């Protein structure tokens, strides 16, 4: 290290150094304490390679609660072999690592490798936190909302009622009848200290995996349902239902039924009822 080049502290001027000057002049008992600054300081990858090597010498096993906050543009470099032996327990550190992981505008559609080493960090955290917190899911669905319907039936059921609130119906697009049956009650048990219009607003997202016994009970609240929220419904919850029941649900949203006649929960329920019964709907429907 030359006379006048000994790093007095972290500054702009360090960028006009080289790879070999950094290892001889920079202190390791400094780089830890003051780290937040280096995120604003544009170093070359070659200079960051040396900085990554300088902290390897100080913290060899993992990296404390302290270090991972200002990790920034190194999360990308870090490979699963060392990530395994990490610790977090802070909602803050999370967002930072996920913001920079959102530095992939290469393939806006799944490029045949959507999630590599982030996969690990997540499973690494959920074990650390214990369960899946209300707070926790909010910040996850903010980077990956579709991850909810990209779990296995198991991990879905280890999920308490007070962590359904953080769901809006944007998450439950690519969900099949199996995964919705798991989530359904958890909602009905979460939103049980409630009633009326305040009740329905939230419940609408899941109603695809619900039973006849609670289609009856909905009608007697004079509630309104759309047509898009009828194509969801399970085949076998629909067929016990009378004319007046359907008309006390879809009600105003019914007119455009004619168009969606040859589709899932309709094409059969039409035939099931009487000809006369359908003609009182005055929507031009056949079979009886």
């Amino acid at each position, epitope marked *: 290290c030359p006379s006048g080049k000994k790093a007095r502290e972290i500054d702009e001027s360090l960028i006009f150094y080289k790879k070999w000057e950094l290892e001889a002049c920079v202190d390791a008992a400094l780089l830890a304490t003051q780290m937040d600054r280096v995120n604003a300081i544009p170093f*070359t990858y070659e200079q960051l390679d040396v900085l990554k090597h300088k902290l390897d010498e100080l913290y060899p096993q993992g990296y404390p609660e302290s270090v991972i906050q200002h990790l920034g543009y190194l999360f990308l470099k870090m490979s699963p072999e060392d990530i395994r032996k990490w610790n977090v327990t802070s909602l803050e550190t999370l967002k930072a690592l996920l913001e920079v992981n959102k530095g992939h505008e290469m393939s806006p559609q799944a490029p045949r490798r959507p999630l590599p080493q982030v996969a690990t960090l997540i499973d690494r955290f959920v074990k650390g936190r214990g369960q899946l917190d209300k707070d926790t899911l909010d910040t996850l669905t903010a980077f990956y909302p579709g991850y909810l319907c990209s779990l296995s039936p198991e991990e879905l059921s280890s999920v308490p009622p007070s962590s359904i609130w953080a769901v809006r119906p944007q998450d439950l697009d690519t969900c099949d009848p199996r995964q919705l049956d798991v989530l359904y009650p958890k909602a009905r048990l979460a939103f049980q200290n409630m009633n009326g219009s305040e009740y329905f607003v939230k419940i609408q997202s899941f109603l695809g995996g619900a039973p006849t016994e609670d289609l009856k009970a909905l009608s007697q609240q004079n509630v309104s349902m759309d047509l898009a929220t009828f194509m969801k419904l399970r085949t076998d919850a629909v067929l016990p239902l009378t004319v007046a029941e359907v008309q006390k649900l879809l009600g105003p949203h019914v007119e455009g039924l004619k168009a969606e006649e040859r589709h899932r929960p309709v094409r059969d329920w039409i035939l099931r009822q009487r000809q006369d019964d359908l003609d009182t709907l005055g929507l031009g429907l056949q079979g009886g």
Partner: single-chain antibody
Amino acid sequence: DIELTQSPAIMSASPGEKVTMTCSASSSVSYMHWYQQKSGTSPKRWIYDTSKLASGRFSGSGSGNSYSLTISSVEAEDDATYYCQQWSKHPLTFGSGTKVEIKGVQLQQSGPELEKPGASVKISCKASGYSFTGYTMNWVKQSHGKSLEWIGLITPYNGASSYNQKFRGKATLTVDKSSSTAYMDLLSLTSEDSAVYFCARGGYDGRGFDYWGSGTPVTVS
């Protein structure tokens, strides 16, 4: 701050003569880089790291203050303005320029821009042929009559940008990684700033600006 005095102002070296041009420094210096510009077009990497030649009659030598470039056998193809750039303290400064009269990775910028004094403009600089988020992007000012002055730079990935404090507030360096096209935003223009502006890529382990761009002059009236 460190400012460099070149000599001579206008050299007149003959074909078949040994000549030495000097670049004496105010304070003691670490390393040095020499460049070469043909009037109108972009400069090119000639010498770097004191003596280490880039990719065979030229050379470089010195210690502390005294530092000099030397030509062995002068020809009729070595007639250009020669400059000296320092690499020690923030910020980066070039020499005034050594003129030699004989005794007898593509970085495409936007078109030349004309505006009114008291308004703003954005000029662009697109890259392709290398991984864009590992190297930098550097902006320099070639004025009429004066020399090269380094404005600032930016590491695209991180949005991280440093400036020569001379230009903090006149200069705004912006980037979009998807198209790999870096922008400078010059705010409130004067009859002084009517000059040329070059975007350049920094080399491996900060070994000078080995590639320079086209050139977007600016005109203010």
